[PDB]
Amino acid sequence: SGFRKMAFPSGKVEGCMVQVTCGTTTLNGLWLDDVVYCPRHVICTSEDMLNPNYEDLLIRKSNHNFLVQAGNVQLRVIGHSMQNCVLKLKVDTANPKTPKYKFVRIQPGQTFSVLACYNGSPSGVYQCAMRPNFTIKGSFLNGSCGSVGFNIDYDCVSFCYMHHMELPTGVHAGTDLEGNFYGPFVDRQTAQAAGTDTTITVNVLAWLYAAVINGDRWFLNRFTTTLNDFNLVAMKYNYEPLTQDHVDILGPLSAQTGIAVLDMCASLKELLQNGMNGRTILGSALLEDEFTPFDVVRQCSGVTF
Amino acid sequence: SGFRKMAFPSGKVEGCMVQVTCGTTTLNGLWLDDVVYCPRHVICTSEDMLNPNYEDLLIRKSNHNFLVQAGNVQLRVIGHSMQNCVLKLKVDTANPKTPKYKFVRIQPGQTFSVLACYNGSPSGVYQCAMRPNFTIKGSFLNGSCGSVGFNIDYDCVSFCYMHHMELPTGVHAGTDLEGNFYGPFVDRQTAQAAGTDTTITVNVLAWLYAAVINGDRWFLNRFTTTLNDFNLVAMKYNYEPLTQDHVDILGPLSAQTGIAVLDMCASLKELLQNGMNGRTILGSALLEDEFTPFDVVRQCS
Ligand SMILES: O=C1C[C@@H](C(=O)Nc2cncc3ccccc23)c2cc(Cl)ccc2N1
Ligand SMILES: O=C1C[C@@H](C(=O)Nc2cncc3ccccc23)c2cc(Cl)ccc2N1
Ligand SMILES: [Cl-]
Ligand SMILES: [Cl-]
Ligand SMILES: [Cl-]
C-alpha cells in the first residue's frame, strides 16, 4: 500500500555526471562513452547570451578551453562539435560506468526522473512530467544547467531531457539529448514565456485508478459518459483532450479495478464540476497529473531495475 | 526557483542492495563491508509470525541456510548474529561498492529517501518523513522488506530506516539499522495499530518559509502570537506542539525572509482557520509537512 511520487533509481545516471567549465561559466555534462554532452550556452558570457552566434563563439574555442572534471580527475578534451543546442566534447577516455542507454524525445504528459546536479555532483532526484506547454515544473538553482531527465526501461537508461534555463515564472525549459528544445524556446537571455498550461487528463485518470487500487472509492459514481461529451467538459476546464489511444492505454487499470475508462471519466467530470468537497484523494486536495498509466502499473506491481 | 519533494540520489545505496533468502522467504538485505543487514523475520514462516521466538528459530539455522545474492553472484555466509530486530549475516566478500556510511536513529519529523527494492533489485526512490506516530507513509508491496531509508551528507550515507512491515491502515513500520523499531511496534503478526497521526508543525512552518523565499506571500498577515496561544490553536487541528527547539531551528529561515517565527505561526493559525480559498502554496492545496527546516535551506536559494 501507499502511493508516492517515485523517481527511477539514479545510480546509472550518477556515474555519468561531470563538471564542464568554459571560462567563467561552470555547468554539468553527461559523459557517455567518449563524449561529454552539455548545453551549448557554456561557451557564453552573460553578455553573449543577449544575442549569441554559437558557431562564431565556438570556432574561437580550442579543446583546452573546456575543462571537464569527472570526480577529482580531469578529462582531456580532444574534439568539440555542436548539435542543435547541445555541445559535444570528445574526450580521450570512454566512461567505464557508461550504462546501456538511448536518447529519446518524449511527448508532453510523459514523465521522467531528473537528477539535479551542481558542479558535476548529483544533489537530488525527483520525478516530473513534461507539461503540455513543454515546460517542466522543476526545482533548479543557478549551476543546475546540464542536469538530465531520464527513464529506465529494463536495464536501459533513456535520456530524454537536458536542463538549459529557467523562465520568469520559475518553470524550466530544456532540450532532448540531441539539443532540440522542448517547446517554443530559444537559448538566449531574452523575453520568453510559457504558454497557458493544461492538465494531463490521461495521467489524472491513471492516478484516480491508483487511488482505487489503494482503497479510495468515494469519488466513484454509477455514471458513464461518451468520449465526445467528456472532451467537451474537459476542454472547458483546461484539461488536455482524451484520445482513444489514452482510453486503450488505461485498459489494464480499468480491467484490474473493474471501472471502465468512461466510467472513471464520469467521476472526473463530477470532480471538475463540483470539486472534492473537503475530501482528499491519495492525500491530495488537487487532481494529480504527473503519474502516467505506466507509472501507476509499475508502482502498483513493483517493477525493478 | 521551484520546490519539489526531492530524494537523495540513490546510487550509493543501490550498490548495497542484495537479495536474502531463508527457506521460502525472500526479502532485501543491505550489504556494507562484509555484513548483510536484513529484517530478522526472514527466518520466519507465515505461521511463526504470530508469536515467533527469534532466538529459538535462529539457533536452528546454520550459515548455509541463508542464500545471499548480489546481482548474479552468490555471496558465502560465514557467520550470523541478531541485533534487536535485525539479522547480520557475515559474508566472505566485502562490498566493493560500500560508500562512506553511518547508522543514525532519527526523530519524528525527520525526512529521508527510501529506495524501494524487491528481490534485491531497486525499483524506485521516494522521499518521506518519520511521522509523529513513528510510522512512515511509504509505498511498499510484499517483498519490499529490507528496503532502506537514508540521507546523504557530503559523500556519506546515513542509513536511518529498514522496512519491516505494513500496518492495517496501509502505513509502514520499521527499525533503525541497529534493529530498534521506531514506535511501539513489534515484528509479529499480532494486532497492531498506529497512534493518531498529527501534522509536523515545524516542517509546515519551514515549507511556508520556502514559499516566501520562492516569492509567495499571500498567506502572511499583520499578526504575531505567543508560542503557547499558537500551540493551543495548533493542537485543535491535530498539529504537533511547536517547542522552543523548533523556534530556534527556524531562526535562519526567519532571518533570511525577515519574518519572525511567531509571525509565521500567526500565518499558519490563519491558514488553519480559513483554508486556502482556491489558492495554492508552492503548487499544493494542502499544508505540506514532509520538508524539514534543513531540507528547505538545502533546496532553496
Ligand atoms: O540567467 C540566465 C542563466 C541561464 C539559466 O536560466 N540558468 C538557470 C537554470 N535553472 C535555474 C536557474 C535559477 C536561477 C538562475 C538561473 C537558473 C540561462 C540559460 C539560457 Cl539557455 C538562457 C538564459 C539564461 N539566463
Ligand atoms: O503480512 C505480513 C508480512 C510482513 C509485511 O508486513 N510485509 C509487507 C511490508 N510492506 C508492505 C506490504 C504490503 C503488502 C503486504 C505485505 C507488506 C510482516 C512483517 C512483520 Cl515484521 C510482521 C507482520 C507481517 N505481516
Ligand atoms: Cl478540483
Ligand atoms: Cl499499461
Ligand atoms: Cl533526527
From Swiss-Prot, chain A:
Inhibited by pyridone-containing alpha-ketoamides compounds 13a and 13b. In turn, alpha-ketoamide 13b (tert-butyl (1-((S)-1-(((S)-4-(benzylamino)-3,4-dioxo-1-((S)-2-oxopyrrolidin-3-yl)butan-2-yl)amino)-3-cyclopropyl-1-oxopropan-2-yl)-2-oxo-1,2-dihydropyridin-3-yl)carbamate) inhibits SARS-CoV-2 replication in human lung cells. Inhibited ex vivo by michael acceptor inhibitor N3. Inhibited ex vivo by compound 11a and 11b. Residues 1-305 form the Peptidase C30 domain. It catalyses: TSAVLQ-|-SGFRK-NH2 and SGVTFQ-|-GKFKK the two peptides corresponding to the two self-cleavage sites of the SARS 3C-like proteinase are the two most reactive peptide substrates. The enzyme exhibits a strong preference for substrates containing Gln at P1 position and Leu at P2 position. It comes from the Viruses. Changing residue 145 to A: Complete loss of 3C-like proteinase nsp5 cleavage. Changing residue 90 to R: In strain: Beta/B.1.351. The active site is at 41 (for 3cl-pro activity), 145 (nucleophile). It is found in: Host cytoplasm; Host Golgi apparatus; Host nucleus. Residues 1-305 are cytoplasmic. There is a cross-link at residues 5, 90 (Glycyl lysine isopeptide (Lys-Gly) (interchain with G-Cter in ubiquitin)). 3CL-PRO exists as monomer and homodimer. Only the homodimer shows catalytic activity. Interacts with host FBXO22; this interaction promotes the proteasomal degradation of nsp5. Cleaves the C-terminus of replicase polyprotein at 11 sites. Recognizes substrates containing the core sequence [ILMVF]-Q-|-[SGACN]. Cleaves and inactivates human TRMT1, preventing tRNA guanine(26)-dimethylation of tRNAs. May cleave human NLRP1 in lung epithelial cells, thereby activating the NLRP1 inflammasome pathway. May cleave human GSDMD, triggering alternative GSDME-mediated epithelial cell death upon activation of the NLRP1 inflammasome, which may enhance the release interleukins 1B, 6, 16 and 18. Also able to bind an ADP-ribose-1''-phosphate (ADRP). This is 3C-like proteinase nsp5. The chain holds residues 3264 to 3568 of 7096 of the full protein.
